[PDB]
Symmetry: C2
Subunit: 303 residues, 2 copies
């Protein structure tokens, strides 16, 4: 029997509520971090180079025993530039139940993991939010952050100012567009770096002590968003230690020590040092995509 | 933006002729065995167990440069259910989601035929099929098309299914009561059984015979005995895959002489006078070739 096909529009209609998405993501992160005691099977991503066209195909299968869900995300990146599809299988008989868009899931799931980390890691008296970058991830983060948290001031810097200005006028609340990374981050309590810089743009010397940084961009071993002082002096949280030590250049080039996985903090195995300067380095994980995709399918197929 | 969805019957409708499928498989096999200069990107398959339901998900992506095609095969083993995704290689765009079962059956049968044209002994008159499932039909269809046998024989663990086969099929098929009766005097043997312990013993095999060993796809299962695996000249589609997945190879300790692609390219000889086994595991680039044929035919 043919699978259902769920377009980007159909996916977004079944993922309007972050409050429905955050809890299973917290469960998934915690379970992943339990490893062999947690029921998640998430093998290393396989990437197949298509050199003749300057492209990559990535494949990210995952199974969650706890939710009883089997998925595979297939993503292509080409120098939209990122295109993703999520496959959802019936875990009891292997049948292919759905092929759905993966871009929306990725935007929403990444923003949601960042919010979870920020809930746990932001300092006392978190009044200022700063966003570095102005693309898809800046929008999805802005959406969930301004609804989950109460910020007095939201600031933005982008490599090209015109795009930050467009962002600012499009979006509902007030956002202060800044001339530099420096101006944007000075006095900021929470920082979101959703950028395509390959060399450090955020320097530890500008960071307010106790600030929390969700570092989302620079998902290659040679690419960095953050300097050595910031990566070495902050308490460093990640989603996956294995993935970070293979894929994150901020981690690898700085030589920084990983304190914990976010899932270890959710489960109580590791403390949330929200008083100290913190970096959450997000790479993304197949089980996060699994969680959102399951949530989309169960919603679509019933209500 | 939405991909095309091709059902099993649509795939079958666009894969009617094996003489269009065989030449690009030959090129793919040779290009895979040439290494990096052959342009084939084929990572080791990723397996995800779902122990709660005693099942597994398998994922096999591939890119071919010669063909300029990009696919991923997703198969659940629990009874194999396969899906093939085909992408626009210049784009990343998902062009099609198609059934993988028909492709699997057609591709495997075509690769056995290629092996058989290269490795069957001189004066090959007798064909023998062990097993009577999906793979037996697809093998029979292409083999009677590609070769002219004086006699075709079959055995299956349940005789009822062997006679049902012999009735459905166009041409005379000798149903045989034992494996031994079926293979003695056989020039070409196809093993596509559900056996997990050796059912074919070297003792019964005519010197020079060619065996296509398609069954026993797990490292703890076998169809053939030690004598056959060690005395035969052993060919495979992929050496890496056989040393990981093939119980007949591992439990015997047999040495692999050549990849089938090396024979096609001229890098290794076809020792067709000697008793030969071709151990077929299946490769992502083999499915990619079939999927590309299908999609281009459908698209036209
Ligand atoms: K903090
Ligand atoms: K032979």
């Amino acid at each position: 029997r043919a699978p259902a096909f769920l377009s980007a529009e159909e996916v977004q209609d079944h993922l309007r509520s972050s409050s429905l998405l955050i809890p299973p993501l917290e469960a998934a992160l915690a379970n992943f971090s339990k490893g062999p005691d947690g029921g998640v099977m998430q093998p290393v991503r396989t990437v197949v180079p298509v050199a003749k066209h300057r492209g990559f195909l990535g494949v990210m299968p995952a199974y969650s025993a706890a939710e009883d869900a089997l998925t595979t995300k297939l993503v292509t990146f080409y120098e939209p530039s990122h295109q993703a599809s999520v496959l959802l299988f019936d875990p009891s008989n292997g049948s292919l139940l759905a092929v759905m868009d993966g871009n929306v899931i990725t935007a929403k799931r990444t923003a949601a993991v960042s919010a979870i980390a920020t809930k746990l890691l932001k300092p006392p008296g978190s009044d200022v939010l700063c966003i570095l970058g102005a693309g898809v991830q800046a929008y999805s983060h802005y959406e969930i952050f301004t609804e989950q948290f109460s910020f007095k001031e939201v600031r933005m810097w982008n490599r090209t100012r015109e795009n930050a200005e467009k962002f600012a006028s499009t979006v509902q609340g007030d956002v202060r567009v800044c001339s530099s990374v420096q101006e944007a981050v000075t006095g900021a309590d929470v920082i979101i770096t959703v950028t395509m810089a390959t060399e450090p743009i955020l320097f530890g010397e500008w960071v307010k002590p106790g600030a929390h940084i969700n570092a989302v961009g620079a998902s290659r071993p040679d690419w960095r968003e953050l300097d050595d002082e910031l990566m070495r002096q902050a308490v460093l949280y990640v989603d996956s230690r294995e993935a970070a030590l293979k894929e994150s250049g901020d981690v690898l080039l700085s030589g920084a020590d990983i304190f914990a996985e976010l899932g270890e903090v959710i489960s109580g195995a590791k403390p949330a040092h929200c008083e100290k300067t913190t970096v959450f380095k997000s790479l993304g994980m197949a089980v996060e995509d699994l969680v959102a995709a399951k949530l989309v399918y169960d919603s679509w197929s019933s209500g």
